[PDB]
Structure 1
Amino acid sequence: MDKFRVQGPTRLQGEVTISGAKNAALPILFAALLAEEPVEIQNVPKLKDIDTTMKLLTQLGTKVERXGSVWIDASNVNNFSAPYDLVKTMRASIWALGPLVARFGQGQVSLPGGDAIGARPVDLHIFGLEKLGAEIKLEEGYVKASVNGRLKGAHIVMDKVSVGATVTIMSAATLAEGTTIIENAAREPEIVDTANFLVALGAKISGQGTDRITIEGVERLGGGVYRVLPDRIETGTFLVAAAISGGKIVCRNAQPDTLDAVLAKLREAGADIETGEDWISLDMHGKRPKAVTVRTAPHPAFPTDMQAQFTLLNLVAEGTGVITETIFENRFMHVPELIRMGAHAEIESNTVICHGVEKLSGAQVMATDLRASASLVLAGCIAEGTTVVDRIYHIDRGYERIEDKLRALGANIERVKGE
């Protein structure tokens, strides 16, 4: 069981190159099932889910190869079924459904039983395809969708906002006959990226990033080269890494416009920030951060995925600051871990009240949340002594070699074993 062993305190400073966003890469990879011509997806991070997706795609008859890029040739998809064995570890598997039925007239995806770990409904996906003219067949453990000819554009009102279902509906609609309108569409930067990818293949889509996406169906999608957007949360993580350690950092391969809220929040903390078209710099000038007040909310407001990071910031900032989760519940489980590191805070309902301390102290800590976990590693960097963060496979799943990046920033960190 891998652990990160960190020796602090160390000032995090220098440069880091942001990896492609896993959350844009995934939907884009599935959308490539629509491309009749070879496609080159650049800036794809080396992550578990990417591998699982490549395997799933190969199983379908897709010709797949990888490095920085993932090369895809789906001009010849022959197997319209995603089996239990390959979808078992990945919810995103449902994304194969729509492209299959839209392009080939049929798709089937295996669904983990009710009791399986991480098992969640995909109702929105299925009923969305239905609105598009897909004939649906359901039996415990699988969903099949089919159509005679092209799907039919429809006016679709979403009762629940869903990143997942928005991708499925927007994707399949690029091949349908007519216009499809998605009201209450997810607004995420990853949704905009997915749409941009589709458009790059010849799709007709507008409104991406707003509450209303409009797709005009076309004959077919071609091939080409597309560069996956930078990972906004990863970028936020490294900004905070410099912000809490008096450091200065320049993030390469970034997209400032996907971080308005995070950047303004950092400025409130006394950070000196600069941005370019593809870079972001953060300079603390050796100073301790100032405590901030944070309210998480839907994009493009302050992101809940930056919460644990900002909590940490408050915990070592000058002064008191409150962090409120306005939508999500139970997002503070990891706070007791930080308090074991010498932090001072109180959790009250949907908020964490932070009292900044001078220096944290090393400890053996653990968190199951990717973000919280990463925050633990950051704390280990600036804390006094030795910190051992357990179960870092959680981090490995969403961050591309975070220890390598941290090391280049000046961290005393290492991957160690323990069973």
Structure 2
Amino acid sequence: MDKFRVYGQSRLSGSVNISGAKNAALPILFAAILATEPVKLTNVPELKDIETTLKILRQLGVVVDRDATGAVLLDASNINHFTAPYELVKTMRASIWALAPLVARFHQGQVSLPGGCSIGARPVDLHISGLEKLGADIVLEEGYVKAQVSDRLVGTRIVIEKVSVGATLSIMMAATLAKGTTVIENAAREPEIVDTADFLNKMGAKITGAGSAHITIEGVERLTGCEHSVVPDRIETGTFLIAAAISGGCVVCQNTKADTLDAVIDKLREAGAQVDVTENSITLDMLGNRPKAVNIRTAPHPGFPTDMQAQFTLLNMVAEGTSIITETIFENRFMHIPELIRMGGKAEIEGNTAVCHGVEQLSGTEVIATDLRASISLVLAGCIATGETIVDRIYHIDRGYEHIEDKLRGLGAKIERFSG
């Protein structure tokens, strides 16, 4: 069981390279099940989720590997198995995305129904419902969601009653091969959705409206292939900007996308940070100042993203003043707070809200990670706390961040990966 040993009390400053969005790469990799010709993906981060996805793809008959340039070369021309097995799906519920394309292209597909997840209730009822609207027959047999359709799917109007990134993507993927036109009202607008749609369009799809709540897809018989560079990861960018914001440092993020972080950038500024945005970089200079507490309310894009909530909870815990953090996406995504309280943080939780009271300095001790995106807050806390900090179960961190120790050490942190 790997752990991080972190020695704090150091301002984080310098340059860090942002990688492609983990959550654009994942849906793009599953959407790739639709490609009848070779696919080349660049800027795909090196992290566990990608590896898990590749394992799922390979057992469907997809040949895919990252070559020495770092590019991911994929050939889905001969899929001969149509089941994403329980043993793989249980490790990453996003694999639910394998069902839509399998069903749309091969008219059948089977995926283990995701079970429980720590951060909250996460059913996939909207995905199923949406696929059923396109004409799929779906049953749940022995823990497996089984889909089938006698003929090509049929495009129709679909209003997803809840804003859902995942359901918006399952439906959009399936619609690219449906007959006629599909319309997805109340679609999630996340930048990763825009990227998947762009990726699909490069293969012959016909999607317009991605990024808005109204997506239109004109179905085609089949998709070909393409080369595609994944959109920068806004969450990784946010995380490093916060690294500077919580340590009074100055950080430059390279290869960023200007407009995917407005909510986050506005809050950093509200917190007292000076942030400079160019077309391909974002620089945050905290000018050696302590942050000013800010309220936070998570919500679907373009609002403040839940994947940046813990990072900002940390900022508030060392800020000056009181703050209210409300999480509306996942009702139980506050696991970091008590771990951060072990370090000296002050916060009270009540339902989906946390009231934090900022302190001057945290102090190191041992804490446990449990959220692949949120737990990064614990590592950052180690960087600015007094003495030593030990973050256990960092394997969670490895699913959502690539070379995190290298990038952090690159900003001046003293972090070593060890075991036992």
Shorter-chain TM range is over 0.9
Task: Give the superposition deviation at 1:411.
Answer: 0.4
Distance 1:311 1:115 in 2: 25
Q: CA deviation at 1:121?
A: 3.7
- What SS does the corresponding residue of 1:94 show, helix, strand or coil? helix
CA–CA separation in structure 2 for the residues paired with 1:293 and 1:115? 30
Which of the numbers 303, 306, 314 marks the counterpart of 1:304? 306
Distance, in Å, in 2 between the alignment partners of 1:109 and 1:163 is 19
Question: Which among 162, 175, 178 is matched to residue 177 of structure 2?
Answer: 175
* Paired residue type of 1:384: T
Question: Which SS does the other structure have where 1:32 is aligned?
Answer: helix
Query: Which aligned pairs between 1:151-230 and structure 2 lie closer than 5 A?
Result: 151-230=153-232
Q: 1:133 aligns with which of 114, 132, 135?
A: 135
Partner of 2:64: 64
Post-superposition CA distance 1:233-289 (Å, at most 9, x none): 111111010011111111012112110000011111111111112211011122222
**What is the rounded CA distance, in whole Å, between the counterparts of 1:344 and 1:101 in structure 2?**
49
Q: Give the Cα–Cα distance (whole angstroms) in 1 for the partners of residues 321 and 314 of structure 2.
A: 13
Q: Sort the Cα spacing of 1:199 and 1:81 in 2 relative to 1 into closer, same or farther, 3 A.
A: same
Letter in 1 for 2:16: V
Q: Deviations over 1:87-117 (max 9, x none)?
A: 33222222222212212222222336x6899
Distance 1:244 1:98 in 2: 41
1:323 aligned onto 2:313 = no
> For the residues of structure 1 that align with 2:347 and 2:148, how far apart are their CA atoms?
54
Deviation at 1:180, TM superposition (A): 0.3
SS in structure 2 at match of 1:405: helix
Q: Please give the alpha-carbon distance, in whole angstroms, between the structure 2 residues aligned to 1:2 and 1:335.
A: 22
- How far residue 149 of structure 1 moved from its aligned partner, in angstroms, is 3.8
Structure 1 pair 343/89, CA: closer, same or farther in 2 (3 Å)?
Answer: closer
Which string of whole-angstrom CA distances, capped at 9 and with x for unpartnered residues, describes residues 159-185 of structure 1? 233222211110111111100011222
Question: Is the CA contact 2:121–2:330 (under 8 Å) kept in the aligned structure 1?
Answer: no
When residues 221 and 284 of structure 1 are mapped into structure 2, their CA distance, relative to the original with a 3 A threshold, is same
Deviation of the 1:152 alpha carbon: 1.0
Number of residue pairs matched by the alignment: 417
1:43 aligns with 2:49: no
- Structure 2 match to 1:332: 334
The answer to whether the 8 Å contact 1:249/1:281 transfers is: yes
Whether the 8 Å contact between 2:14 and 2:411 is mirrored in structure 1 is: yes
Seen in structure 2, the aligned counterparts of structure 1 residues 205 and 415 have a Cα distance that, compared at 3 Å, is same
- Match for residue 377 of structure 1? 379
The partner residue of 1:397 within 386, 399, 402 is 399
User: What displacement does 1:383 show?
Assistant: 1.1
1:276 aligns with 278
- Cα 1:119–1:108 shift into 2, 3 Å: farther
Aligned residues: CA RMSD: 2.1
Match of 2:5 in 1: 5
Paired with 2:39 and 2:150, the residues of 1 have a C-alpha distance of 27
The one-letter amino acid paired with 1:86 is: L
Give the residue type in structure 2 aligned to 1:178: G
Tell me, yes or no, if the aligned pair for 1:369 and 1:394 is still in contact at 8 Å: yes
1:201 and 1:69 map into 2 onto residues whose CA distance is 18
Q: Secondary structure at 1:208's aligned position in 2?
A: coil
Shift, 1:348, TM fit: 4.0
Instruction: Please state how far the C-alpha of 1:382 moved relative to its aligned partner.
Output: 1.0
Q: Is the 8 A contact 1:18 1:254 kept in 2?
A: yes
Change in Cα spacing, 1:377 to 1:32, as seen in structure 2 (3 Å) is: same
CA distance in 1, matches of 2:117, 2:402: 27
Does the 8 Å contact 1:12/1:247 carry over to 2? Answer: yes
Q: Residues of 2 paired with 1:349 and 1:137: CA distance?
A: 35
Question: Partner amino acid for 2:64?
Answer: V
Change (3 A) 1:345 1:147: closer
For residues 32 and 4 of structure 1, do their structure 2 counterparts lie closer, same or farther at Cα, with a shift above 3 Å needed? Answer: same
Report the residue type matching 2:348 in the other structure.
Answer: E
* Alignment check: 8 A CA contact 1:182 1:213 kept: yes
- Counterpart of 2:31 in 1: which secondary structure? helix
Aligned-partner Cα distance in 2 for 1:372–1:240: 13
Change (3 A) 1:334 1:55: closer
Q: CA deviation at 1:39?
A: 0.7
CA distance in 2, matches of 1:309, 1:343: 13
1:228-377 correspondence runs (5 A):
228-326=230-328, 328-377=330-379
What is the deviation of 1:349?
A: 4.2
Distance 1:119 1:302, change over 3 A: closer
Matched residue type, 2:94: A
Structure 2 CA distance for aligned equivalents of residues 193 and 132 of structure 1: 23
Identify if the C-alpha distance between structure 1 residues 324 and 127 changes in structure 2 by more than 3 Å, giving closer, same or farther. closer
Relative to 1, partners in 2 of residues 1:350 and 1:133: Cα closer, same or farther, differing over 3 Å?
closer
TM-score (norm 2): 0.93
CA separation in 2, counterparts of 1:293 and 1:145? 44
Tell me, in whole angstroms, the C-alpha distance in 1 between the residues paired with 2:285 and 2:116: 48
8 A Cα contact 2:189 2:212, kept in partner = yes
- Identity among equivalent pairs (%): 74
Q: Within 2, Cα distance between the matches of 1:337 and 1:87? A: 28
CA distance in 2: counterparts of 1:111 and 1:293, whole angstroms: 36
Q: Which residue of 1 aligns with 2:24?
A: 24
Counterpart code for 1:8: G
Following the alignment from structure 1 to structure 2, what is the Cα–Cα distance between the partners of residues 2 and 183?
44
CA contact (8 A) 1:203 1:218 kept: yes
CA contact (8 A) 1:99 1:172 kept: yes
CA deviations over 1:352-389 (Å, ceiling 9, x no partner): 33332222211112242234421111111111111111
Letter in 2 for 1:205: I
Report deviation, 1:17. 0.9
Change beyond 3 A, Cα 1:246–1:28: same
CA distance, structure 1, for counterparts of residue 13 and residue 168 of structure 2: 39
In the alignment, the residues of structure 1 paired with residue 170 and residue 329 of structure 2 have an alpha-carbon distance, to the nearest angstrom, of 24
